[PDB]
Symmetry: C3
Subunit: 162 residues, 3 copies
């Protein structure tokens, strides 16, 4: 009775819960783009890894339509999480604070049917709100285009525990 | 308890993990300085800091600077600007003042002379912390003639000394 | 008490093993590229950091030969790890599962001796098998080239504890 997760009984002694150390799950769900009046969505099947106090969302490559210079990519965790994971388990340790967390470069191929031109855009975790994770995608300039080829992207942040 | 050692701690009467170890948020409002090949400038930024388990994350926002070299150093002066009770020493890496190539990543920097930026794909990493100044190396990707630089948001992470 | 790593005796109390919190080592070893009939290898000296349930492999910049549009970059951990680290210490928590983990942008300079053109490629941890870590490198298009200039790249993933 004397132990509190992530401290746990490990082979009759005091150890660290294996579940805290590593948990794998999956999100089959919708990624939505919105920017300067452009809107579209695509389905992705993504692995999720939860390791110590961090969650990692491993988005695969996907194809979308036009994007703006700056815009938002939103992951809807309200549906699609593999049980027993719940929407609440994707809440950041900074809750619904607005942040600039895990900012990275992502190269997106812009085209209108032909050979894509790759733009180096800037992506970060901005805000989680009621199960929707909003990622800012901006910078790198733009070209006229009708289609976007997105790379595989890993999105990571510290996960709520209270 | 006298018989527990941080980060192990009393958590609602039992043996648990200190919440402060699991998540601690702070802020740095301070000076980022660029130096390369005789070029020198500085800019003030507001940045969230998140300490999670044995890692520190410094979430730099987008900022604008002046000319950069093919290779150069970006320095974050943590001697001042940290929100109390966080102290300069709390930013020291677990590798102390070793010279490293840690967390190497792509950073796209927009170079211009006032007009539309050309983005160069540069290579950034944590190289050395010394006396409260974190030095990041920024090199590669080639260059153009320019007088202004548009820097992306960049998250700087590394293992924190204990 | 009966303590189970990473829970350990510290200073007479129940604490967290310093070994679990931070360990620094090195891999001096052979990185091999394979793609579309192209094959070559390079030697690298890389720092390794193990921090909580993560390993970080800090590859330095290196020069290679021709790459394909898509290919594998493989790290041979069977030899080259600094004692007391062993090959098994590099096994992922997802063991030998095929994954798309830690996907990121990497800019590689392609040339035939002259001025490099930088391609934004997409790199991820794909599979560890019998001491060999296989990273996928694809996307971003290509040009005709005989030489590749690779940036410093840090690759990280959760490490097995079983
Ligand atoms: Mg293959």
């Amino acid at each position: 009775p004397n132990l509190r997760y992530p401290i746990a009984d490990v082979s009759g002694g005091i150890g660290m819960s294996p579940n805290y150390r590593f948990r794998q799950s999956m999100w089959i769900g919708i990624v939505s783009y919105s920017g300067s009046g452009l809107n579209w969505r695509v389905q992705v099947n993504s692995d999720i890894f939860i390791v110590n106090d961090y969650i990692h969302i491993c988005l695969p490559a996907f194809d979308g339509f036009s994007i703006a210079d700056g815009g938002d990519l939103s992951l809807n965790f309200v549906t699609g999480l593999l049980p027993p994971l719940l929407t609440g388990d994707t809440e950041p340790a900074f809750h619904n604070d607005v942040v600039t967390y895990g900012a990275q470069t992502v190269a997106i191929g812009l085209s209108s049917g032909g050979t894509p031109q790759y733009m180096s855009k800037n992506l970060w975790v901005e805000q989680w709100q009621d199960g929707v994770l909003r990622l800012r995608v901006e910078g790198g300039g733009s070209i006229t285009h009708s289609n976007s080829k997105w790379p595989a992207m890993t999105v990571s942040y510290p996960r709520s525990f209270t």
